[PDB]
Amino acid sequence: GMTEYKLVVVGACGVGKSALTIQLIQNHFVDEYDPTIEDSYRKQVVIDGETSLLDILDTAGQEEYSAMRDQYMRTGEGFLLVFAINNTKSFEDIHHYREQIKRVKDSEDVPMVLVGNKSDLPSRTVDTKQAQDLARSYGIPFIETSAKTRQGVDDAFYTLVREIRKHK
Ligand SMILES: *CCC(=O)N1CCN2c3ncnc4cc(-c5c(C)ccc6n[nH]cc56)c(Cl)c(c34)OCC[C@H]2C1
Numbered sequence: 805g806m807t808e809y810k811l812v813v814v815g816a817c818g819v820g821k822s823a824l825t826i827q828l829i830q831n832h833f834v835d836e837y838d839p840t841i842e843d844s845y846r847k848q849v850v851i852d853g854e855t856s857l858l859d860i861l862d863t864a865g866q867e868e869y870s871a872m873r874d875q876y877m878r879t880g881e882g883f884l885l886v887f888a889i890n891n892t893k894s895f896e897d898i899h900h901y902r903e904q905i906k907r908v909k910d911s912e913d914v915p916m917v918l919v920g921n922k923s924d925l926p927s928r929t930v931d932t933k934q935a936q937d938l939a940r941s942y943g944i945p946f947i948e949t950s951a952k953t954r955q956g957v958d959d960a961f962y963t964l965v966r967e968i969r970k971h972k
């Protein structure tokens with residue numbers, strides 16, 4: 805019946821991949837979620853008045869290449885590129901995450917959203933403009949989020965489904 809989209813949440817350790825996903829699915833903020841737990845969650849959502857089944861993979865584990873990570877990138881239809889706005893290293897790591905998805909999908913136009921997480925925190929080291937300029941250069945949306953307050957959480961995932969729908 806309804807369309808199903810495979811979403812993948814990527815980004816450096818500690819940016820809030822797990823916190824963002826569990827806020828979307830279960831409507832609470834996790835303070836300390838085990839960094840090895842990689843699991844997928846299913847949720848029906850209405851976006852722009854059309855229902856879709858989202859199947860969301862929250863990535864975890866070691867800094868390693870694997871043919872299996874290549875696989876869930878290959879099956880993934882859209883990617884959240886998550887950094888934390890208080891962690892410049894996580895922002896500098898976005899290039900790596902995009903390159904490895906671009907490697908396995910052989911496209912610079914795969915549906916993606918840049919997510920600047922932890923927007924509730926005062927000591928920002930990455931400004932709106934620097935993230936907007938990065939997303940513009942990539943040809944993707946930028947969304948500021950807080951897993952803690954829920955600000956922008958739905959918008960990040962919904963915006964990615966909007967990007968997958970335009971793609972064909
Ligand atoms: C605190 C744990 C955690 O969340 N992470 C640390 C290990 N990660 C990680 N580190 C470096 N490079 C990663 C690359 C990929 C990757 C992509 C994006 C695409 C295809 C592919 N094929 N082999 C690896 C990859 C992934 Cl999937 C990583 C990477 O995931 C593990 C979680 C990530 C963050």
Ligand SMILES: Nc1nc2c(ncn2[C@@H]2O[C@H](COP(=O)(O)OP(=O)(O)O)[C@@H](O)[C@H]2O)c(=O)[nH]1
Pocket residue numbers: 815816817818819820821822823824834835836837838839921922923924925949950951952953
């Ligand atoms: N203040 C704040 N802390 C967050 C936010 N998102 C995640 N955290 C915290 O940052 C840490 C890492 O989050 P986690 O979701 O485990 O990161 P992951 O390794 O990307 O899954 C945890 O302590 C979270 O509670 C956020 O939006 N705001």
Ligand SMILES: [Mg+2]
Pocket residue numbers: 821822823837838839840841862863864
């Ligand atoms: Mg996690």
